[PDB]
């Protein structure tokens, strides 16, 4: 029973709310991606660096 201005305003606001969430979610996903990159990276790095460390240490004992 109201003017087209009021629906245009309200729908513009609804669209803005969605676009806002739309942006925030992508940003959130990439930030987590950066975190997981470093976390997973370190786990892999420590795992094999330690493995070869022990491998070669034993070889060093054999050498001595």
């Amino acid at each position: 029973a109201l003017s087209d201005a009021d629906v245009q305003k309200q729908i513009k606001h609804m669209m803005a709310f969605i676009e806002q969430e739309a942006n925030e979610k992508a940003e959130e996903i990439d930030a987590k991606a950066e975190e997981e990159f470093n976390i997973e990276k370190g786990r892999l790095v420590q795992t094999q660096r330690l493995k070869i460390m022990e491998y070669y240490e034993k070889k060093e004992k054999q050498i001595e």
């Binding site: 087209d4 629906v7 309200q10 729908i11 513009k12 609804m14 669209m15 709310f17 969605i18 676009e19 969430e21 739309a22 942006n23 979610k25 992508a26 940003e27 959130e28 996903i29 990439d30 987590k32 991606a33 950066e34 997981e36 990159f37 470093n38 997973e40 990276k41 370190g42 892999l44 790095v45 094999q48 660096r49 070869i52 460390m53 070669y56 070889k59 060093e60 050498i63 001595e64």
Partner: protein
């Protein structure tokens, strides 16, 4: 006029689906990259330990011969 507001909302939802799927796609690419970089670091780490190994082995041989 309520149907246009509905369509604008539906478009916003569509965009939301594209945006989150896209962020998740980037996340996956970054993860593969993370594995690649970690591995590059590992190859360099291995080289360093190896250099130390090779130095010690040759050095131990000559000193043992001097014994």
């Amino acid at each position: 006029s309520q149907s246009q507001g509905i369509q604008q909302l539906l478009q916003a939802e569509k965009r939301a689906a594209e945006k989150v799927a896209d962020a998740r796609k980037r996340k996956a690419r970054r993860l593969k990259q993370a594995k690649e970089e970690a591995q590059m670091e590992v190859e360099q780490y291995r080289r360093e330990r190896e250099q130390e190994f090779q130095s010690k082995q040759q050095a131990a041989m000559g000193s043992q011969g001097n014994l």
